[PDB]
Amino acid sequence: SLSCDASGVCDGRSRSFTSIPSGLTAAMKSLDLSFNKITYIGHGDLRACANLQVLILKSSRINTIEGDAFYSLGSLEHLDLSDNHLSSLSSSWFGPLSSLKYLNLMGNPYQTLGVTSLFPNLTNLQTLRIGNVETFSEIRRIDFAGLTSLNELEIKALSLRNYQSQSLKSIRDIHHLTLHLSESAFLLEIFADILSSVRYLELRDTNLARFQFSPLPVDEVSSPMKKLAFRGSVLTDESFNELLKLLRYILELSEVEFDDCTLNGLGDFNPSESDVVSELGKVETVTIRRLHIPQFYLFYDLSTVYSLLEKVKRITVENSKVFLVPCSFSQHLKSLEFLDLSENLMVEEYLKNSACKGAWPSLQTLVLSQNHLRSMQKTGEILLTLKNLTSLDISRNTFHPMPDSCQWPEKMRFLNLSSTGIRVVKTCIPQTLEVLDVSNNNLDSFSLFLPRLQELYISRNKLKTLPDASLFPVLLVMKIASNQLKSVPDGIFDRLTSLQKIWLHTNPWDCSCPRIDYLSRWLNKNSQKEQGSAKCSGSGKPVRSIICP
Template sequence: PTGVCDGRSRSLNSIPSGLTAAVKSLDLSSNEITYVSNSDLRRCVNLRTLKLGANEIHTVEEDSFFSLRSLEYLDLSYNRLSNFSSSWFRSLSALKFLNLLGNLYRTLGESSLFSHLPNLRILKVGNSNSFAKIQEKDFAGLTLLEKLEIYAPNLQTYAPKSLKSIQNISHLILHLKQPVLLLEIFVDILSSLEYLELRDTNLNTFHFSEVSTNETNTSIKKFTFRNVQITDKSFNEVLKLFNYVSGGLEVEFDDCTYDGVGDFRTLDTIKFLGDVETLTIRKLHIPQFFLFHDLSNTYSLIGKVKRITIENSKVFLVPCLLSQHLTSLEYLDLSENLMSEETLKNSACEHAWPFLKTLVLRQNRLKSLEKTGEILLTLKNLINLDISKNNFHSMPETCQWPGKMKYLNLSSTRIQSLTRCIPQTLEILDISNNNLDSFSLILPELKELYISRNKLKTLPDASFLPALLVMRISRNIINTFSKEQLDSFQKLKTLEAGGNTFVCSCDFLSFMQGQQAPVRVLIDWPEDYLCDSPSSVRGQRVRDTRLSPSECH
């Protein structure tokens, strides 16, 4: 595109000369540039994006960025800068994004770097070894940030009120090795922060002491703990942070290690978990999983949780009693775990998950559709069921399913044919990526059919699917379709049929290139519609293919 200069990874040791006002975006990342002079960018008055990350820059002259008044994006990360000057940023009033990660500084300098950046929305500061001190004036002048990332695994000093000057932070990412200063930071952001993400922290020694704050107007809506270590004792301490949050809270643990056995006996003293509405756990490592308790201490606290995701964490059972206590649960995702029909029967016992609407059991150890459907009959309110990526292979002639089911995902389950096991109530059916060579089911209420990556030779018969609005049938072995076939789907709004083995006959080409062509409904036209035969036009786009008069008459 005009005005875009891509100079990545060119072994450059300085900024190229001759840059002009025509340049709007300049990417010089991953080079060997060591120095930025005040004349290098002087004529780039229309520059919006400047990427200088992953170089060897140790010096930036005072007025190097002076003429960049339109600059919105500046990346100086992973260089060798040990000091910053506020004069670099003084004229960058349009700047929205600034990345200073991974340089050699211990502090952000003597004066406030960011006080002339009223439009800054995303700021990244810190490094993995030397950055040790946050000072009170560091963030002065910033009032509103969408994202603030502070990479400070070796932080030793945090001056109180340093972050308090920012009136609104949507998302704060803190990389801290130890939790020593966590509470001091937490107090300062209580009233300004919406989403706190803690990364790479060993919380095993974390102890919560009552924070001295009169903040009642807390705006925190979400906590994420990413690659964090935690014990039974410190987990109970972490939960006390939630005491300062009012309203529906979302809590996420991603790739964490739990050095405990689920001993939550002291949880009874914690009454404020009632505000957690959404709990997400991904890739949880429990070294002592064989000693893990039955979670009965949590029963009194989980009644208000509406959404739970526990993914890729070796879950093989949700105890019946636990399921029965999840009385507000509407959404449960247990993807990539070890659930089988035997354990699912215990989990979905009578009165389990009474208000559950969506259940995701993608990539578990289910083998029988018949048993799975029967087990789930206890879930009277179930509407959406995802059992994709289980190995069902075959489908029985008939099945029983919860009466309200509208959505069923059976993609990537190795099924080879369809039977009346599929519930008649469905509005959405996903059977993509299987071994199906035909579709002859009558589904009177079906609005969306996803059947890509199978072995179908023709479109399904429209009379089987009178309500169909959306059909995705790409990457099958369909040779052709006609105007009459498409017209028979009277309500069809969206069709994705690219990636098939089209025989580019004269009739097919004249239909697809003519006035009556269905381009209005084809969402992947024309890129994915290629001729497979005759061999003379193989690989050409259907839209552009011309056959000689002799081939057509």
Template sequence: MPCALWTAWVLGIVISLSKEGAPHQASSLSCDPAGVCDGRSRSLSSIPSGLTAAVKSLDLSNNRIAYVGSSDLRKCVNLRALRLGANSIHTVEEDSFSSLGSLEHLDLSYNHLSNLSSSWFKSLSTLKFLNLLGNPYKTLGEAPLFSHLPNLRILKIGNNDTFPEIQAKDFQGLTFLQELEIGASHLQRYAPKSLRSIQNISHLILHMRRPALLPKIFVDLLSSLEYLELRNTDFSTFNFSDVSINEHCTVMKKFTFRKAEITDASFTEIVKLLNYVSGALEVEFDDCTLNGRGDLSTSALDTIKSLGNVETLTVRRLHIPQFFLFYDLRSIYSLTGAVKRITIENSKVFLVPCSLSQHLKSLEYLDLSENLMSEEYLKNSACEHAWPFLHTLILRQNHLKSLEKTGEVLVTLKNLTNLDISKNNFDSMPETCQWPEKMKYLNLSSTRIHSLTHCLPQTLEVLDISNNNLNSFSLSLPQLKELYISRNKLKTLPDASFLPMLSVLRISRNTINTFSKEQLDSFQKLKTLEAGGNNFICSCSRGLCATTSTDCGT
């Protein structure tokens, strides 16, 4: 055979063998000594062969597996976690999981399962987590699917396209769930008492685009559910008519609307729904859109009288398309008297009207982070008799510019003890300031200040001035117990004589080279010191470590 032909033949054989070996390389698992095997995103078309009892955790998610056979996992008798999500599985043999008696975590989400079988779970009495979301089934099977799972605590079912019905038998056998997630964006039928068969649910996440069936579901859950979360719900046409409820005491504690669409009219209907909860309630609106102008019906609100037992109200990232036409919400002021905690974050708030502040007579905690508050409008909000019981005010990342004006405006808040005005641009600190007389906690982190003055209140017990441009600390604060001054330019520890009560000092990421044992001992009440991230030069003669490093132990 000529030399050139021989060379070509050998190269062809090598290339052919490398191509044949490629699938084998892609299908290999990465397993550690503890039996945790990682096979994610490896273009697998089937469950790898050769799995043994040594495998404790198997992750085969994000592959192209289409079939789970009865023998594929037979030897994995010690398997505790099996993740098969985001594959193309359309068939699971009846006894595919029969040998997995120790399994606690099973993920079959986002596959192509059009039918579910209760026989899959007959041997899985130890199962705690089951995820069946995102498969194209229409029902949860003919027989009760979860009756063999007494230890199940987290269950995720349904899909956003082809799951139209919840049947009376669907949850039989389940008595307690920590979390239940139901994808039912196009739910059309709900059999009464279907969810009531579960005696206790800590957290229900319900994806429901149209809320027509919400009243029926809500009534069934009042005596068993602690936390209801609705996602991607359009309340444009929601109408909550009076319903008959036998329970005098409900266990619901929290209600979240996430990515919901709300109108002026439906807001009133939502308040009606909240009035059926008997105990103290936390209500949260997260990433919601208000398609209205705040023009609420006075006659409808007159029938409500209050926000029910809502004590905590949280609003994050509220979008109001017609904000330029928005009303002042005067019609709901009278409903707010019992609310104790309010968070309105990243929602373009620039003013809380004085009259609303005066109606918030029970308010103890107010968080207006990431908004547009300035000293001028804050003065109107913190008017005389506003927020009489407020003890915590958070104005992080707003448009405040003057410490002197901010302190002066807040003097009206006689019970204010905690103030967070971090991430505002103050730059400089005046020599003197006025503050509420009970101030104990002040957060001035990330405010670009470069020096400290007697503007700081002498009553402080906790001060956070981290992430600024400070190169020294020589201020007397006789009651200060905690000082957070990391990420500045300090070259030495503060003088202990200025801080006789200090018990916590966090001074990491400064430019400190060294400090002596005597300096450290001078803080007589110090219990916690964090000083990492400094360029220490350590020396035994100073009673510290004997090496040069970025951190020194004491």
């Protein structure tokens, strides 16, 4: 039932094949036989595909593949056998695939990679994925013998029972390593074998409650690891302190991420010499999202965090119930340039403490995108302490109507007031602004003169009339999609003399011929500026299609 195209891209995906389709050719460059029922693959099912570059056999129900089944596929660069029923992996399968770049074997019920090295002859491999949720249980020294460089290696071993020493050490260059571990029993050991190879390490679903640090036998303590990421992990204050002791080896680590993690406040370490601040070495960026902190008893030290974040330049802590960032804590974040506190519980009174006198000196960008702020004037007043602030985002906050006069930090040139519920716009908004976003609100008109405005986002409001062009002399980008606009005054866009991009879609354009003449001609003379397609209200055809006598 195949359906191929001019360039050899054939599609047999999700048919109902019970065996590879008969009579394939050497013209096919890609064959997608996913979601089928190919239970067995024999000696002569892919013989005639000498030019095949892509073979996708994901989620079929393959449980048997003859040893020389891929023998004549020397031009194969992408092989995906994921989510099948392969209980065993044969080394003869990969013998004739020296040109293979991507190999996905994950999702198969095998217990190990076998007794024979499967990839020694895959000189050009770049991406390898192996493992599964409950069967894969052993990793051996012969498993990756031969591989020297890999862009991406993913190992799913949530049921791991044993890891041999140095199994990972033979590989010298791994740009991205993703390990799915359920327990930490072998983590320490695995670290010993990846510290001189892994650039980006990613741990998934790991319970690190009982993780303990212990000296490692590095060769020169020069780890090329730049990004460390924990996702869906469980930690304790005790095991957390053990984890940061590992930083002493990754002298170059610049980004640490914690996604959907849990921090059980139990244990509560006390040993002094077993704290090791080390100023988190060279951590430049810290990102925390959806951190769940069960039973946050009373007051913790917090001082065992000041000296730790002294050199961090970017911090993000979103959707983690943050309601207060103590002043003395902010005063120690001397290098913080970017702070993102989106989706938390901040309110004026506590922001006032978080943004005290010497708080976040040198902070350039602040994001308070979805908290419990109620007053624009009060917020602006509180942020006057941040002398270096140039970008402020306070979108998705329910504000009371803004006054006519406000005080904002001196260098503020970016202000995001999106999804803020405002119905009017007033001079509280400073003339210094370059970028302003008041999209997704309840505006009926815009009359603010912003001489330096370069970008206006006013999409998703109720403007019936377009803003006067003289209001933005050097405007580069204007977004005014989804806005009840029916027409524009003749010649208005030629007056936006520096305009580069404009969004006009989703507006009930009155395509009556006399009236729509200007708008139509301008769009035909400026298609490179329009993003999306302004359509006629009623019919639905593109406004640029109209041609009036």
